[PDB]
Every structure is written in C-alpha cells, then in structure tokens.
Enzyme design. Structure first.
Site, PDB file in Angstrom:
ATOM      1  N   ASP A   9      99.033  11.180  32.960  1.00 34.85           N
ATOM      2  CA  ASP A   9      98.395  12.357  32.412  1.00 34.85           C
ATOM      3  C   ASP A   9      98.042  12.134  30.942  1.00 34.85           C
ATOM      4  OD1 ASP A   9      97.623  14.915  31.670  1.00 34.85           O
ATOM      5  OD2 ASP A   9      99.152  15.902  32.828  1.00 34.85           O
ATOM      6  N   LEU A  10      96.763  12.065  30.630  1.00 35.63           N
ATOM      7  CA  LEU A  10      96.344  11.748  29.246  1.00 35.63           C
ATOM      8  C   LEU A  10      96.649  12.913  28.315  1.00 35.63           C
ATOM      9  CD1 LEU A  10      95.483   9.236  30.304  1.00 35.63           C
ATOM     10  CD2 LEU A  10      93.078   9.873  30.079  1.00 35.63           C
ATOM     11  N   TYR A  14      90.091  15.502  26.019  1.00 38.09           N
ATOM     12  CA  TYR A  14      88.793  15.603  25.308  1.00 38.09           C
ATOM     13  C   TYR A  14      88.955  15.370  23.804  1.00 38.09           C
ATOM     14  CZ  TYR A  14      86.640  17.792  29.482  1.00 38.09           C
ATOM     15  OH  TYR A  14      86.175  18.109  30.739  1.00 38.09           O
ATOM     16  N   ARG A  46      97.841  22.589  18.160  1.00 42.49           N
ATOM     17  CA  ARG A  46      98.850  23.217  19.012  1.00 42.49           C
ATOM     18  C   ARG A  46     100.049  23.707  18.205  1.00 42.49           C
ATOM     19  NH1 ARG A  46      98.374  20.352  24.956  1.00 42.49           N
ATOM     20  NH2 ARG A  46      96.149  19.836  24.648  1.00 42.49           N
ATOM     21  N   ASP A 101      91.492  13.582  33.786  1.00 40.55           N
ATOM     22  CA  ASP A 101      92.524  12.972  32.952  1.00 40.55           C
ATOM     23  C   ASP A 101      93.857  12.658  33.660  1.00 40.55           C
ATOM     24  OD1 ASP A 101      94.686  14.827  30.840  1.00 40.55           O
ATOM     25  OD2 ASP A 101      94.108  15.414  32.878  1.00 40.55           O
ATOM     26  N   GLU A 102      93.904  12.794  34.984  1.00 38.30           N
ATOM     27  CA  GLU A 102      95.143  12.515  35.730  1.00 38.30           C
ATOM     28  C   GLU A 102      94.897  11.522  36.859  1.00 38.30           C
ATOM     29  OE1 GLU A 102      97.189  16.215  36.800  1.00 38.30           O
ATOM     30  OE2 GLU A 102      96.596  16.996  34.824  1.00 38.30           O
TER      31      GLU A 102
HETATM   32  C1  LIG Z   1      92.376  23.060  32.970  1.00 34.01           C
HETATM   33  C2  LIG Z   1      91.100  22.631  32.310  1.00 34.01           C
HETATM   34  C3  LIG Z   1      90.979  21.369  31.730  1.00 34.01           C
HETATM   35  N1  LIG Z   1      89.823  21.010  31.145  1.00 34.01           N
HETATM   36  C4  LIG Z   1      89.664  19.675  30.524  1.00 34.01           C
HETATM   37  C5  LIG Z   1      90.078  19.658  29.051  1.00 34.01           C
HETATM   38  C6  LIG Z   1      91.220  18.637  28.993  1.00 34.01           C
HETATM   39  O1  LIG Z   1      91.199  17.807  27.835  1.00 34.01           O
HETATM   40  C7  LIG Z   1      91.127  17.805  30.263  1.00 34.01           C
HETATM   41  C8  LIG Z   1      92.537  17.497  30.781  1.00 34.01           C
HETATM   42  O2  LIG Z   1      93.217  18.738  31.048  1.00 34.01           O
HETATM   43  P1  LIG Z   1      94.817  18.933  30.849  1.00 34.01           P
HETATM   44  O3  LIG Z   1      95.597  17.651  31.157  1.00 34.01           O
HETATM   45  O4  LIG Z   1      95.283  20.163  31.599  1.00 34.01           O
HETATM   46  O5  LIG Z   1      94.988  19.227  29.280  1.00 34.01           O
HETATM   47  P2  LIG Z   1      94.913  18.153  28.095  1.00 34.01           P
HETATM   48  O6  LIG Z   1      94.804  16.673  28.469  1.00 34.01           O
HETATM   49  O7  LIG Z   1      93.790  18.634  27.203  1.00 34.01           O
HETATM   50  O8  LIG Z   1      96.274  18.464  27.244  1.00 34.01           O
HETATM   51  P3  LIG Z   1      97.734  17.911  27.630  1.00 34.01           P
HETATM   52  O9  LIG Z   1      98.256  17.008  26.530  1.00 34.01           O
HETATM   53  O10 LIG Z   1      98.599  19.134  27.800  1.00 34.01           O
HETATM   54  O11 LIG Z   1      97.717  17.138  28.934  1.00 34.01           O
HETATM   55  O12 LIG Z   1      90.423  18.646  31.193  1.00 34.01           O
HETATM   56  C9  LIG Z   1      88.724  21.923  31.129  1.00 34.01           C
HETATM   57  O13 LIG Z   1      87.649  21.581  30.582  1.00 34.01           O
HETATM   58  N2  LIG Z   1      88.797  23.158  31.664  1.00 34.01           N
HETATM   59  C10 LIG Z   1      89.936  23.545  32.274  1.00 34.01           C
HETATM   60  O14 LIG Z   1      90.029  24.672  32.801  1.00 34.01           O
HETATM   61 MG   LIG Z   2      96.287  15.807  30.035  1.00 34.39          MG
HETATM   62 MG   LIG Z   3      98.891  18.330  31.261  1.00 36.18          MG
END
Ligand SMILES: Cc1cn([C@H]2C[C@H](O)[C@@H](COP(=O)(O)OP(=O)(O)OP(=O)(O)O)O2)c(=O)[nH]c1=O
Ligand SMILES: [Mg+2]
Ligand SMILES: [Mg+2]
Length: 377
Positions: A9-10, A14, A46, A101-102
């Site tokens: 999980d990145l 973005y 954050r 991102d996963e």
């Molecule tokens: C849930 C969600 C994610 N995204 C995008 C933005 C995120 O950067 C990318 C990955 O989502 P996430 O892994 O949920 O969030 P993240 O990587 O930004 O933060 P974290 O460190 O907690 O993992 O997907 C959207 O554009 N709209 C959405 O509703």
């Molecule tokens: Mg992430």
């Molecule tokens: Mg996450």
DNA sequence: ATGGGTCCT
DNA sequence: AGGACCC
C-alpha cells in the site's frame, strides 16, 4: 492452502507522485485537489488536521499554509501505478491490483523455494523484518511462523526495490490471506510493514471499530447491517446466518460473515493489463447538447491518446451520465473504426448514445460525463 | 464527493 | 444496464 500473502500500500500516493515531480513541495504541507476536493495529502498536511476527501474550504481553513496541486488528470499516477505492479511481478508473476496504489502478491511458492535452500542451523537464524502485529512472540519451531517471517523479508525486499528503483515509499502487511494482509498492512504507517502471526488474528479483527472497515463490506451493506442492529465485528460473527441470508442473500451473507471471522479463501488473481480505459469530468451544470458534445469530444481525445499506447483496441464504447445514481448506454465500436481521422465517426456514436438517455428537446441537468473504452481484445 | 477501477446479476 | 465493491 496455507498461504503467505503480502499487501502493498503506497504512502499518500498522488502526493508522493507530486512531491517527486516538484521536490519544492516535499517539505511543505501538500494537498492534491480534484474540483472542490482534497482527495489526498502528504503526511505533513495530515499533522495539521487535513484528512483525505476533505473539502478544499475545510482544508485551507484547517491549514492556511496548505499547498494545492491539481490531480484531476490521472495520467502520471496511472503510469507510476503500473511501474509498481510491474516491479512486483518480477518477484512473483501473480500480482493483483486494487486501485492505483495497492497490490497483493501470493508469496507462498517464493517462501517455500527460499525455505528449501536453508539448512538446519540456518532456520535458527530466521528473523523478522519490520513489526510483528500485537508484538506477538515468534516461535521459530512453528513452520507457519517461519514461513510468515520469510514473507516479511520478501516484503522488505519489495519495499526496498520500490524505493531504490521508483523513489516510492509504502506499507506492507504479510498474512495468511488477502483480508488479513490488507488489514495488517495499515497497522504501522507511513513507510513501515507488519506481519500477522496466526495467534493474533482474532486480536486484529476485533481491533476494528466499524463493520465497514472490513474490505468487502461497503456503504450499502454496512447501512443494511446497522438496520439489523449489527455494529461490531462480533455482532456480525454471532448474528443468525438465516436472518442474514434472508436480508442480504445467500452470497453476501455467507461471504461477509466469513470475513467477520478473518476467513478469506479468495486467490490472488493476476490483474494483467486493464479491462477498460475511461475518462471522466464532473461539473456544476450541463444543460446544452452542444456543450455536452464538446465535453464528450475532449474525453474522447484523451482516451484516443491512451487507446493506443498499450497497443490493443477496445471493441465497445459506453457513455455514462449523472443527472440532477448513474445511467449508461453502450454499443460495439464498428470494426473499421477499431483498426487504429477516427474522432468524427466516434462522436456521432456517442451523441446517439447521449440522446437515447437524454431527451434533448426537454430541459436537462447533467453533473457528470464519462466515456469508457472497454472489451479490449 | 473525485476520477477512476473490479466483478456479479 | 445497473448495482455492489475497492482505491
Ligand atoms: C479512496 C480514494 C482514493 N483516491 C486516490 C488518492 C490516493 O492517493 C490513492 C490511494 O488511496 P489510499 O491508499 O486510500 O490513500 P493514500 O495512498 O493517499 O494515503 P495512505 O498513506 O493512507 O495510504 O487513490 C481517490 O482519488 N479517490 C478516492 O475516493
Ligand atoms: Mg495508499
Ligand atoms: Mg491506505
């Protein structure tokens, strides 16, 4: 059967991509903006109260120093997304994407090959990389503990390669299935990893406070469950299977109740190349067919640019609207169009689709337009 | 919500 | 086509 799965999980994906492109934003509170939304932000923002999918008004009031970059054009995030999955597929070819991102990877064959190569004394010897969930004691005589620890070492090699080759930071969770790998990957963030040993599985699942925190239980299912008086993971564990089946159907009821026990037998599936390409735009108001056509033309031109660079071609086109959930119309793309001036035969197709859904002689009000290329062959 | 994706019915 | 889910 006895598997070792990793979920990757990145970190603030973005924002990570934006910070790499402009290292001037890397030390500053950063929000990635889409229309009126801060979809994600870096870990500096954050700290200051900024949350994902927070209102741009709420964010910049909560954080006046907050730098915003526009992330409506997904191109670069999508490109980086595939570089990460390609890198992971070098470790094991069966990598399942979940969003941009996963990734899940089934490490179990890799773990067993690594184990075959160690000697007696070399087991003694085996060490974790990163956190052990719930600080559980390792028993090196437990072959499941050993395999999970090797999983954690592979996970660390994956994260180190992502960093060394791509510049990207992320979390990993290693467990016996996808559910648990995904739940555990988030225990230590950012840029950390955690391994779940079998004895701590109940602890992980009961650590959740909302039933919706279970991957696979979404907005509608959770609301349904709430109506039934089911609020914790234990309520769902202990609720009558029969009443649940009646309310949600055999399939949903049996799957989610299984999930409430931490049980998940779904295989890691090879995602491979995408099933579809789409482009969306949302707006306050669209009420003119002339403007709708212009809108649809821009979405097309971006889609055609992507069409294209993967090399393979779509066999169906779909148009999605949202009025004021969604409505859509699709049809095949003619074969003489497919072999790829395409634009002028393509827009008339889409306008015919548009007019089937939207009576254009009658006043309308659209808030979303989306074109999808799908059924790629 | 945004701007995408998935699979199932 | 629509409806769940995931990010
Ligand atoms: C849930 C969600 C994610 N995204 C995008 C933005 C995120 O950067 C990318 C990955 O989502 P996430 O892994 O949920 O969030 P993240 O990587 O930004 O933060 P974290 O460190 O907690 O993992 O997907 C959207 O554009 N709209 C959405 O509703
Ligand atoms: Mg992430
Ligand atoms: Mg996450």
């Amino acid at each position: 059967s006895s598997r070792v799965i990793v979920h990757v999980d990145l970190d603030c994906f973005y924002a990570q991509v934006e910070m790499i492109s402009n290292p001037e934003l890397k030390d500053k509170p950063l929000g990635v903006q889409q229309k009126y939304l801060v979809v994600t932000c870096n870990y500096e923002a954050r700290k200051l109260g900024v949350k994902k999918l927070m209102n741009v008004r709420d964010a910049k009031e909560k954080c006046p120093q907050l730098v915003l970059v526009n992330g409506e054009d997904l191109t670069r995030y999508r490109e980086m997304s595939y570089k990460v999955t390609e890198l992971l597929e070098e470790f094991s070819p069966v990598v399942e994407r979940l969003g941009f991102d996963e990734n899940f990877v089934d490490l179990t064959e890799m773990v067993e090959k690594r184990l075959q190569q160690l000697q007696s004394d070399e087991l003694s010897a085996v060490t974790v990389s990163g956190h052990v969930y719930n600080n559980q004691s390792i028993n090196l005589l437990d072959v499941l503990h050993i395999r999970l620890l090797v999983g954690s070492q592979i996970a660390a090699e994956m994260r180190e390669a992502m960093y060394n080759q791509l510049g990207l930071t992320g979390c990993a969770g290693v467990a016996s299935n996808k559910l648990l790998a995904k739940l555990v990957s988030g225990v230590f963030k950012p840029n950390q990893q955690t391994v779940l040993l079998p004895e701590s599985c109940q602890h992980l699942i009961h650590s959740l406070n909302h039933i919706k925190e279970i991957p696979g239980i979404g907005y509608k299912t959770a609301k349904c469950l709430e109506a039934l008086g089911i609020n914790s993971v234990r309520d769902l564990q202990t609720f009558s299977p029969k009443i649940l089946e009646k309310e949600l159907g055999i399939s949903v009821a049996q799957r989610i109740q299984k999930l409430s026990f931490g049980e998940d037998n779904s295989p890691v599936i090879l995602s491979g190349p995408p099933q579809s390409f789409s482009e969306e735009d949302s707006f306050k108001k669209c009420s003119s067919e002339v403007e709708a056509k212009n809108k649809i033309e821009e979405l097309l031109a971006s889609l055609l640019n992507r069409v294209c660079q993967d090399g393979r071609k779509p066999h169906t086109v779909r148009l999605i609207i949202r009025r004021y959930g969604r409505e859509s119309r699709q049809c095949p793309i003619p074969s003489h169009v497919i072999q790829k001036d395409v634009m002028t035969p393509m827009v008339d197709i889409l306008m015919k689709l548009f007019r089937n859904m939207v009576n254009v002689k009658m006043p309308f009000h659209l808030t979303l337009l989306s074109v999808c290329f799908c059924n790629l062959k």
